Homo-oligomer: 273 residues x 3
């Protein structure tokens, strides 16, 4: 009865058929993502349940990338495809009650928080670096606020794309269009540019300069200064003049003519020989 | 007997099989679907993988937050300095016919929010910086349908309590420059305002302290609220009302009229 | 008679190894490189891991769509309300010397597109909101090289069919305000238009129905297309042409000139 041992070896020990070898384990493990990194070739879906995903801008998110301890970018999305069927990155919210932003960038630093560069195409096309559209009539499509000491809150620079001076004659730095409703619109009373100072400013409201020479401005009181010959295709209403170079009114001309007429008729009616 | 042979065949060698503990060691190096911490680079290289453009179910990465609280993704850094931006989107072919980023937003607050915090020391940075080298298209476009607001709203706030501190600031600053390399000039315009369908509103309206100071109407007439100056001549129509500016012709027209009548009285004077 | 000791040693016990079925259970809780569904938080904490800034191969996450259709990543939510934004980029140190986001775009359509859909009810919300507390730099900069378009193009569309519905709207709205906490005023300007190199084009050009109504030329002269008013005096040069506005000096000189001439005719006539 020496086989009271072989039976207990036949029972208590694992059959190769019923267990993975290390070579087979490696095969299986190699199809799984290592925490040290790997290459995913399919779709990675995130569907958090009662997972405790938080809104914190430091430790929150279904994906959280903390670069505090590392050089490099948090995420890079690259494509050299000639054409494709969708954008690289999509953010979408469907419910009208949604009360948060699609994207919030909270930037401290010494350079531009967000940088959008459109490279030069082989052939010009109507594409833009950034395109904004809103169908909400209750709010501005876009808002900008800044606290600049000596610069514009919005700075627009147009550079001539060509060496020849007369190439960009139809270009502008700022182009504004005011249109009626596309489907069935009967017109519009919308304004072009509205400049206001709710608290009141001492500065010029509109100031135009060319080649380091000021050319035209509208002051804080609404008076304008034009730097060259000007034209009104129409009448201009002004105050009566009280100084030599003030424009003369029709009334002023007529009063001075009438005054001289009276004096001369006086002399004529009373002169003798 | 020969029982041993069978057990030498059908039984597992310790050397060729991972133990329970060893298996735990190996499995812990793999990401659990319930979550984990990745310390290396995660690369996505889909290639005939059925990736879709769908703005709901598409993407090599898809994050659906419909049933959950919190952000979809947070990118955070407390590093003092580094060698690259947090997030980069890049497409290299000029024939590429989709956007780098598409925001399709419904909701009650701002779709995209960009905040530049107050730095310890003022610097030249901007919250958003746009450059285009495509001469065939606007660098940026904005379209809106506001009832009673601006499509673009610009607010400049004085950074200082003192009133004259921001005397060189502006809400909108425009520069018009020649080509950097070898440019001979430019004929580009500053501000171009048009209404292709035609509007009844003021083209330009200027106010200060809630009161109208200067405006240009839809017909191109202007209304100025204070004393004004033309460093030059101003051409106007002949006046037909008391406060209309008088032309040189009108002054000369009247002078000649009075001259004629007086000389006629003088030539026919009778004692 | 002692091999049994060698097999008790060299062979794996049932208790100390996982079966094929139990291995499967454990492996099924791990993410396959072929794809899967993550239900918890995935944290990235690289730390001397060789993460690079490269806009092609860098990032703790890298998505290369060169060989695949579809989007790189999609963030979707159908939630009614929530406690934070979908995507957050945050940098905390004021010495941070890289951007939060860099888009390096080549292609034929818009690099970044932001769309706010029509809400059930109008509300005070924007597609894009920009705010800087950095007094040393513009909140926003735009540069373009357009041949025949605006670097910035703003379109306001009437939200309603009725022509006067949008009478209080504008394409561009500018406000100039004092410092909120204790500000005593501001000297900031509204719109500053300049050409540092000098341009031949009109600085301000206003049109209605594609026809010029008002413009300021490169020399600062203006043309108004209709009746206009100055609530004040207008200073001009003395006229040298028929339709030039007449000065007070010119009126007085011509009146005095005729007076003299008439009085000398009267002083010397005889009959
Ligand atoms: Ni006589």
């Amino acid at each position: 009865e020496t086989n009271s041992k072989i039976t207990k070896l036949e029972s208590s020990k694992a059959d190769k058929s019923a267990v993975y070898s290390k070579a087979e384990s490696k095969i299986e493990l190699d199809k799984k993502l290592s925490l040290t990194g790997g290459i995913v070739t399919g779709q990675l879906q995130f569907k958090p349940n009662k997972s405790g995903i938080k809104p914190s801008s430091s430790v929150g998110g279904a994906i959280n990338i903390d670069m505090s301890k590392s050089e490099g970018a948090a995420m890079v999305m690259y494509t050299n495809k000639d054409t494709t069927d969708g954008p690289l990155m999509i953010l979408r919210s469907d419910k009208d009650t949604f009360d948060q932003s699609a994207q919030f960038v909270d930037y401290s630093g010494k350079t531009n928080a967000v940088n959008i560069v459109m490279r030069q195409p082989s052939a010009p096309n109507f594409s833009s670096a950034l395109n904004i559209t809103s169908a909400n009539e209750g709010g501005s499509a876009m808002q900008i606020r800044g606290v600049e000491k000596a610069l514009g809150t919005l700075k627009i620079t147009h550079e001539n794309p060509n060496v020849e001076a007369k190439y960009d004659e139809n270009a502008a730095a700022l182009s504004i269009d005011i249109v009626k409703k596309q489907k069935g619109g009967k017109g519009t009373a919308a304004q072009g540019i509205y400049i206001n100072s709710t608290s009141g400013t001492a500065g010029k409201m509109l100031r135009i300069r060319n080649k380091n020479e000021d050319k035209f401005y509208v002051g804080p009181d609404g008076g304008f200064h034009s730097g060259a010959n000007s034209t009104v295709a129409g009448n201009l209403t002004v105050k009566d003049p009280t100084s030599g170079k003030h424009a003369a009114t029709k009334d002023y001309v007529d009063e001075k003519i009438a005054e001289l007429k009276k004096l001369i008729l006086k002399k004529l009616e009373h002169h003798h020989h």
